[PDB]
């Protein structure tokens, strides 16, 4: 979430200071629109992770209703964000690429 | 994403459905005919000639 | 191992009447739900008209 | 007082559900005719452009 | 709906029968505290601790004897009605409605 | 047990409004919906009561209209009023469309296409329904859309006959559409409960955009009371424009009695029907105009098909939002465009506005989507 | 489908609640409204305006364009 | 057309009040409901 | 999986018609039901198409009627025809009532009261709907039921005003009822799906009378095809009386234009509306007459409350059956009773017929029930 | 089958509901009043006198 990505992923950082996500402290991965692949993707998610994304999500709802945001300090640390799913997810990308693959076969 | 159904497999699938496809198509067409009896086609109809 | 939790402060949201650990809402409640109930009935009686 | 308004008028009024309602309509009267009246007053001070006309119409 | 409603049921529905029943409950039980050596023991302990007195057998059996189901309807209303006492499940509580529901349930539209 | 749980019709009910679990994060995007139905209900309601007096007879047109107006006390009010209220329904209509849009709610197909039925349905259902007044505006204009009935190769002549009832618009129409109105509202209704159950199926989306199972409450109290609020807001709206300056939105050509020989200068659609007729006159060909027309909403269907981004909420997609309010700019833009009679600047103006509609949606909005994706990098 | 109890999985979290009559309806009402209010609004403004700008520029603009275009000249 | 431009005018007056009364009363009631939800404290305290 | 199983709207569908498990023992008692709806549909259908041309305007009454008749080709046919078809709907209506009766199906309350709504609903819904022709029969007769609007103490005057629109029946009414018709059919419809789901809930009874879980199939093919059959039977019925002697059932007073001064000798209700007006004129008091009226069906509600026997099927209860067809005798009896104008013998005749209705149902049928019980000995 | 709810038990039940019963009844009645403002009763209404 840093200057190129604070301009660009600073649509998610400076301009999600504007578009909100990361300054809202969101989870990058969490932003993926729910899809089936996304669905079972999460089904396979890691546990401690699952809790984490949970608290994140709920909180997001919380301030959302509150229509407030955390301290800009509390606003999320830029860059410095594990790509949570992306190993798991992207793995699934290969999966549905595989079901998709022999499927093509 | 036509590649999804694009493959010699689904290609073969089409090769199967083809003649049937002709069939149901004909069904629709003739239906338009008798239903409509639209003059445009109706003309060519001998002894189905109504006058 | 399990017992250590705790709870937060309502003050910022707290209406005045409850400010004190000193006193019983034994008084307050009927007054509070009173005020609200009043407001509500205002909305019922007016709406009736 | 106001504590018996909030309270007794909960208790001796808003407490019993029915009582709350009977109270409600009981108002519906007073409010109705009243606002009717003062409202009429508003329009009254508004103009005096007609129906005061009768005296001017010389109210035969 | 059971509980509060029963409470609601309670707050309304009194029939002397049960009153007498749980009277006999507190009678039997009444032994079962009085009955027993340590139960009587600690019973003395908090008895003066709180009380400083001991509700005598016929004193506790007196206010007990005095039991009044009018005060059931009324006194019930006095303490019970329109309040927010404790409820705690343990576990996935989703059937816990809101205070705006569960404790809307704290109020009775049965009337 | 709990009859709320128990009673079967109720079992629907609680399942419908009452017991309904719903996203807690829920946003004001809501209100309009019940409004519309309330509107709709009132719509019917008034129309009904309106129907109760009103006659829709050829000699009676302005005639009964007077009887329904000049005679009719509060036929004044109810009439002109809830007439405006129609337009209000349109207001929340286009609004609501926006709701899905910046929502991007397009995720749910049967809902989308549903409200598409709601769309063209609302459109003509009005138009016919609307025209019923048969007023000079709606009259020469009746020659207008009446001339819309003729479009097709080989058909329209015979068609705009069959539509028109014959050689022109006529009392033929008068009955015809008059009924058509009488019917269509019902259609809207059943359509409604339809799309509704469809909704209850999936549940539905959230302004947040996250899976809602995290947080839900029943509409009661929350969405319920909130709804009551927005309703009062409505009576403010309707009961306002009505209550204060009823005629404000009107076009005098209405009160103008239909004068068959008239054909005056204006010929415009309603603030409701507005943005169309511009779009109509925009192109120089028949089915260009129409296919465009149905291609605006139909276009929106494609937009669900055109859905692109890896994230639902444009909230996180600012450049998208630029395309959003920007697209709106193209929209009310299209309004004020129609807001002029045929004019030199306007020609080019709308001429480009269409491209926008095709770009700002079909291209520039989708192109935008792709772009934002590229930027996303996650 | 939904309702509850088949709903979803939540492990190792916690809550806190309060009775309604407790609070005050409008803590810091005016106060809190604030550049909090301007925080949402003002936050959005830049994102919002430009199209509307073009608008006023337009209806104004073309308003002049055709408006003047309605004027008659000599010869 | 609008003789009630007088009569109906009258009603509008009461409207001005009703909302001003209700609108607040309504909004209040809404807050009256939603208030608790506003301030909620929910704890993420994952064990260990 | 199987979309038949899968598709949610279908999930209703299969659950409704298709996948629907149903008592195998099922009996011809059925058919009428779909008929009615088909009827109803056609009803609407025709009415709609009918509406399409027809105008319901004061000067237009017989006028448009001619335009809707004398002009109208197959407006002849559709008009007079499906007009008769209405009566057919009544036919299966009273029939169907019988169906439950010898069925004794009264076991299911919400259904029963439902169809009671269907009952009075059908009744006036017709009557107003019916009267729409505003024909001399329906005209002076309009002065009739118009004079029905006045019954109450202190009210009717003001009421039959409000009902009547004022000092009499008027064009006021014309609009009024005219709409009222336009509305009520819809009401019937939603009412229908209502009672329907109510049915699907319990399932329902069987001519056998035993618990059906022993034997069930889906309507397809069985009840399905069977239904198709009975439909053809209908088109035989309707398309017959229509197709052959359209006017056969008519009363010439209809084609008589309304002549406000007329008031001719007859004043009768439809073969549909028939059995009433006898019942009406029967008693010498206002609310006697009415409370009787609503007390016929209402009486039937009591009959469910009056349900007595330890066995459902009167099939096993012959003496009961005697009361059944016997009661019918009282019924069409009441018809031919109405089948005379006010007459010396008739006076006593119907005078007793009522007692029957009160006995043959309320007493003699219930008394019968008790008796059969006594005999039962098991 | 009134004996079902006829017993000193349900009797007592009634004894309970009675005052409330009066209450809701009053609710209905007054409702008819204000709703209707029916002249028949309306007359007796002082200062609710509208003329
Ligand atoms: C089935 C319920 C409805 C009935 C019975 C009904 C009947 C009528 C009638 C008789 C008129 C002519 C009298 C007049 O103009 O005041 C009319 C006008 C109109 N109503 Fe409806 N309609 C109904 C539902 C709707 C709906 C759903 C809409 C769409 C929001 C709608 C919008 C209109 C419009 C645009 C007009 C003409 C404009 C005007 O008021 O002058 N009404 N309606
Ligand atoms: C007859 C007019 C309509 C009515 C009465 C209607 C009714 C409703 C209701 C009651 C909701 C509940 C939740 C909410 O409002 O957000 C809703 C949501 C929705 N409607 Fe409509 N609607 C109508 C027209 C439309 C249109 C025109 C569309 C789009 C073509 C549409 C697509 C949706 C979608 C996608 C949602 C889901 C919203 C979300 O969860 O964010 N409906 N509607
Ligand atoms: C609007 C007219 C009505 C319609 C469209 C309607 C529709 C139906 C349909 C589709 C069925 C399916 C099974 C069958 O026909 O046996 C049915 C059965 C039934 N209906 Fe109706 N009905 C109507 C009027 C009535 C009336 C007037 C009653 C009696 C007051 C009635 C009470 C019943 C009962 C009790 C059954 C169960 C029959 C059995 O299983 O033996 N309905 N109806
Ligand atoms: C909502 C759909 C319906 C519409 C639009 C409709 C409209 C009309 C209109 C305009 C007439 C007068 C024209 C004429 O008499 O030919 C009429 C006659 C009538 N229709 Fe309907 N009606 C509808 C449903 C019904 C229903 C449910 C019934 C009851 C079976 C019904 C039975 C009648 C009767 C008895 C008459 C008068 C007798 C006659 O045909 O001369 N119609 N209707």
Write out the two tokens for F369: 């989507």
| CB distance G27 to C13 below 8 Å | yes
The rounded Å distance from CA I179 to ligand 4 centre is 11
With beta carbons under 8 A apart, name residues in chain E contacting D18: 111
| CB distance I32 to I229 below 8 Å | no
Pocket test for ligand 3, best of I26, I30, I96, I200 (most atoms within 8 A of CB): I96
How many angstroms separate the first and last alpha carbons of chain E?
Answer: 14
Report CB contact under 8 Å: G54, F329: yes
Closest ligand 3 atom to Cα of I29: 16
The rounded Å distance from CA I90 to ligand 4 centre is 13
Contacts of F260 (CB under 8 A, 6+ apart): F139
The closest alpha carbon to G47, from F376, F361, A19, A10, belongs to A19
Task: Please count the other Cβ atoms lying within 10 Å of the Cβ belonging to residue F174.
Answer: 22
The rounded Å distance from CA I349 to ligand 4 centre is 34
Element (H, E) at I216: strand I216-218
Phi, psi angle pair for A11, to nearest 5° = -80, -25
Residue E54: is the preceding peptide bond cis (ω within 30°)? no
I307 labelled ligand-binding: no
Q: Does A39 touch chain B (CB under 8 A)?
A: no
How far apart are alpha carbons A50 and A43 in whole angstroms? 9
CA dihedral J17, J20, J21, J25 (to 10 degrees): -170
Which residues contact ligand 1 via a Cβ below 6 A? F 40, 43-44, 47-48, 50-51, 54, 79, 83, 86, 89, 126, 129-130, 132-133, 181, 185
Q: Which residue of D has its CA nearest to C31?
A: D6
Phi, psi angle pair for F286, to nearest 5° = -60, -75
Closest ligand 1 atom to Cα of F69: 16
Q: Does E13 touch chain J (CB under 8 A)?
A: yes
Pocket test for ligand 4, best of I41, I43, I136, I234 (most atoms within 8 A of CB): I43
Nearest by CB to F326, which of G8, G51, G62?
Answer: G51
Which residue, by CA, sits nearest to atom 27 of ligand 3?
Answer: I115
- Is the C-beta atom of I29 inside 6 A of ligand 3? yes
How far apart are alpha carbons I312 and I105 in whole angstroms? 8
Distance from CA of A50 to the nearest CA of G (A): 9
The data reach a resolution, in angstroms, of: 7.8
- Is the C-beta atom of I368 inside 6 A of ligand 3? no
Neighbours of chain G (3+ CB pairs under 8 A): A, C, E, F, H
Which residue, by CA, sits nearest to atom 31 of ligand 3?
Answer: I115
Q: Does D47 touch chain E (CB under 8 A)?
A: no
Count structural domains, chain H: 1
Say which experimental method was used: cryo-EM
Q: List, in sequence order, the alpha helices (H) in E1-111.
A: 3-13, 16-34, 37-46, 57-63, 70-75
| CB distance F273 to F126 below 8 Å | yes
Write out the two tokens for G16: 């806190």
The rounded Å distance from CA I33 to ligand 3 centre is 6
What are the CA-CA distances from residue I328 to residues F171, I323, I333, I337 (Å)?
Answer: 49, 8, 8, 13
How far apart are alpha carbons A4 and A10 in whole angstroms? 7
Q: Which residue of J has its CA nearest to D27?
A: J34
Report CB contact under 8 Å: G12, A67: no
CA dihedral I107, I113, I119, I121 (to 10 degrees): -160
Which residue, by CA, sits nearest to atom 23 of ligand 2?
Answer: F115
Residue H48: give the domain boundaries: 4-48
Domain of residue H45, CATH code: 1.20.5.100
Angle at F366 between CA F364 and CA F372, to 5 degrees: 95
What are the CA-CA distances from residue F185 to residues F128, F129, F135 (Å)?
Answer: 12, 9, 21
I82 labelled ligand-binding: yes
Q: Cite the annotated binding site of F for a ubiquinone by residue number.
A: 200
* Chain H from 18 to 47: CB within 8 A of any G CB: 28, 31-33, 35-36, 38-47
Q: Which residue of D has its CA nearest to E108?
A: D17
Residue I268, CB half-sphere, CA atoms under 13 Å: how many? 20
What's the helix, strand, coil split of chain H in %, to 5? 75, 5, 20
| CB distance I223 to I22 below 8 Å | yes
Q: Secondary structure of chain F in the HEC alphabet? A: CCHHHHCHHHHHHHHHCCCCEEECCCCHHHCHHHHHHHHHHHHHHHHHHHHHHCCCCCCHHHHHHHHHCCCCCCHHHHHHHHHHHHHHHHHHHHHHHHHHHHHCHHHCHHHHHHHHHHHHHHHHHHHHHHHCCCCHHHHHHHHHHHHHCCCCCCCHHHHHHHHHCCCCCCHHHHHHHHHHHHHHHHHHHHHHHHHHHHHHHHCCCCCCCCCHHHCEEEHHHHHHHHHHHHHHHHHHHHHHHHHCCHHHHCCCCCCCCCCCCCCCCCCCCCCCCHHHHHHHHHCCCHHHHHHHHHHHHHHHHHHHHHCCCCCCCHHHCHHHHHHHHHHHHHHHHHHHHHCCCCCHHHHHHHHHHHHHHHHHHHCHHHHHHHHHHHHHCC
Instruction: Verify whether residue F53 is a known catalytic residue.
Output: no
Q: Give me the residues paired with residue I217 across strands.
A: I22
Nearest by CB to C49, which of D2, D20, D28?
Answer: D28
Write out the two tokens for I273: 């509306």
Size of interface D-E (CB pairs under 8 A): 5
Element (H, E) at I292: helix I286-306
Strands H43-44 and I216-218 come out as unpaired
Mutation target to probe the E interface, by most E beta carbons within 10 A, among H31, H36, H38, H40 is H36
With beta carbons under 8 A apart, name residues in chain F contacting I53: 175
Angle at I57 between CA F170 and CA H1, to 5 degrees: 85
Element (H, E) at I217: strand I216-218
Q: Cite the annotated binding site of F by residue number.
A: 82, 96, 181, 195, 200
At G23 the three-state DSSP class reads strand
Strands I21-23 and H43-44 come out as unpaired
| CB distance I233 to I36 below 8 Å | no
């Amino acid at each position: 979430v840093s200057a190129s990505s604070k301009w660009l992923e600073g649509i998610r950082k400076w301009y999600y200071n504007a578009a909100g996500f990361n300054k809202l402290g969101l989870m990058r991965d969490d932003t993926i629109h729910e899809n089936d692949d996304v669905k079972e993707a999460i089904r396979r998610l890691p546990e401690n992770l699952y809790d984490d994304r949970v608290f994140r999500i709920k909180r997001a709802l919380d301030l959302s209703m509150r229509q407030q945001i955390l301290p800009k300090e509390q606003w999320t640390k830029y860059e410095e964000d594990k790509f949570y799913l992306e190993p798991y997810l992207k793995e699934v990308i290969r999966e549905r690429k595989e079901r998709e693959e022999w499927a093509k076969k | 994403m036509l590649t999804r159904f694009l493959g010699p497999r689904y290609r073969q699938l089409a090769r199967n459905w083809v003649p049937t496809a002709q069939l149901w198509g004909a069904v629709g067409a003739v239906g338009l005919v008798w239903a409509t009896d639209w003059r445009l086609i109706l003309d060519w109809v001998p002894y189905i000639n109504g006058k | 191992s399990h017992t250590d939790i705790k709870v937060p402060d309502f003050s910022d949201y707290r209406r005045p009447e409850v400010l004190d650990s000193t006193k019983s809402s034994k008084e307050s409640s009927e007054a509070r739900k009173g005020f609200s109930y009043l407001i509500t009935a205002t909305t019922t009686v007016g709406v009736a008209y | 007082a106001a504590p018996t308004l909030t309270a007794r008028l909960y208790s001796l009024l808003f407490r019993r559900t029915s009582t709350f309602a009977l109270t409600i309509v009981v108002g519906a009267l007073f409010f109705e005719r009243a606002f009717d009246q003062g409202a009429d007053a508003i329009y009254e001070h508004i103009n005096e452009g007609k129906l005061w006309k009768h005296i001017k119409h010389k109210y035969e | 709906f059971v509980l509060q409603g029963q409470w609601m049921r309670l707050c309304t529905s009194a029939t002397e029968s049960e009153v007498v029943r749980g009277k006999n409950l507190l009678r039997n039980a009444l032994v079962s505290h009085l009955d027993g050596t340590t139960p009587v023991c600690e019973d003395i302990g908090r008895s003066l601790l709180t009380y400083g007195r001991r509700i005598p057998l016929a004193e506790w059996e007196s206010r007990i004897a005095e039991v009044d189901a009018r005060v059931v309807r009324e006194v019930c209303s006095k303490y019970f009605y329109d309040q927010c006492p404790a409820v705690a499940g343990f576990g996935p509580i989703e059937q816990l409605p809101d205070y705006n529901r569960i404790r809307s349930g704290m109020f009775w539209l049965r009337f | 047990i709990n009859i709320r749980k128990t009673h079967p019709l109720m079992k629907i009910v609680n399942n419908a409004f009452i017991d309904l679990p719903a996203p807690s994060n829920i946003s004001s995007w809501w209100n309009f919906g019940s409004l519309l139905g309330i509107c709709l209900i009132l719509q019917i309601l008034t129309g009904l009561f309106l129907a109760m007096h009103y006659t829709p007879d050829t000699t009676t047109a302005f005639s009964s209209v007077t009887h329904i107006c000049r005679d009719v006390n509060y036929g004044w009010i109810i009439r002109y009023m809830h007439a405006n209220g129609a337009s209000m329904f349109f207001i929340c209509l286009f609004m609501h469309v926006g709701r899905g849009l910046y929502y991007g709610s397009y995720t749910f197909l049967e809902t989308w296409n549903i409200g598409v039925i709601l769309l063209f349905a609302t459109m003509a259902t009005a138009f016919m329904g609307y025209v019923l007044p048969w007023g000079q505006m709606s009259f020469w204009g009746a020659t207008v859309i009446t001339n819309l009935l003729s479009a097709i190769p080989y058909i329209g002549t015979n068609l705009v006959e069959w539509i028109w009832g014959g050689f022109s618009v006529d009392k033929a129409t008068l009955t015809r559409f008059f009924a058509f109105h009488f019917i269509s509202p019902f259609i809207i209704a059943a359509l409604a409960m339809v799309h509704l159950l469809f909704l209850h199926e999936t549940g539905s989306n959230n302004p947040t955009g996250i899976p809602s199972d995290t947080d839900k409450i029943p509409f009661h109290p929350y969405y319920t009371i909130k709804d009551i609020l927005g309703a009062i807001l409505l009576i403010l709206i309707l009961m306002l424009l009505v209550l204060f300056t009823p005629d404000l939105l009107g076009d005098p050509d209405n009160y103008t009695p239909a004068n068959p020989l008239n054909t005056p200068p204006h010929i415009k659609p309603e603030w409701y029907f507005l943005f169309a007729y511009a779009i109509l006159r925009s192109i120089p060909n028949k089915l260009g105009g129409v296919l465009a027309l149905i291609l605006s909403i139909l276009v929106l269907v494609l937009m669900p098909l055109l859905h692109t981004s890896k994230q639902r909420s444009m909230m996180f997609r600012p450049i998208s939002q630029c395309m959003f309010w920007i697209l709106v700019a193209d929209l009310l833009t299209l309004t004020w465009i129609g807001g002029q009679p045929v004019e030199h600047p306007y020609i080019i103006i709308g001429q480009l506005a269409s491209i926008m509609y095709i770009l700002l949606i079909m291209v520039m909005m989708p192109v935008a989507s792709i772009i934002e994706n590229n930027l996303l990098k996650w | 489908g939904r309702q509850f109890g088949h709903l979803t999985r939540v492990r190792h979290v916690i809550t806190y609640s309060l009775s309604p009559f407790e609070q005050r309806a409008f803590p810091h009402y005016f106060s809190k409204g604030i550049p909090n209010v301007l925080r949402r609004t003002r936050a959005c403004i830049l994102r919002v305006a430009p199209p509307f700008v073009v608008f006023y520029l337009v209806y104004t603009w073309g308003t002049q364009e055709f408006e003047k275009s309605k004027r008659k000249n000599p010869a | 057309a609008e003789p009630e431009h007088d009569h109906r005018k009258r009603m509008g007056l009461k409207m001005l009040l009703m909302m001003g009364l209700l609108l607040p009363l309504v909004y209040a009631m809404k807050r009256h409901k939603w208030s608790v939800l506003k301030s909620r404290k929910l704890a993420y305290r994952p064990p260990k």
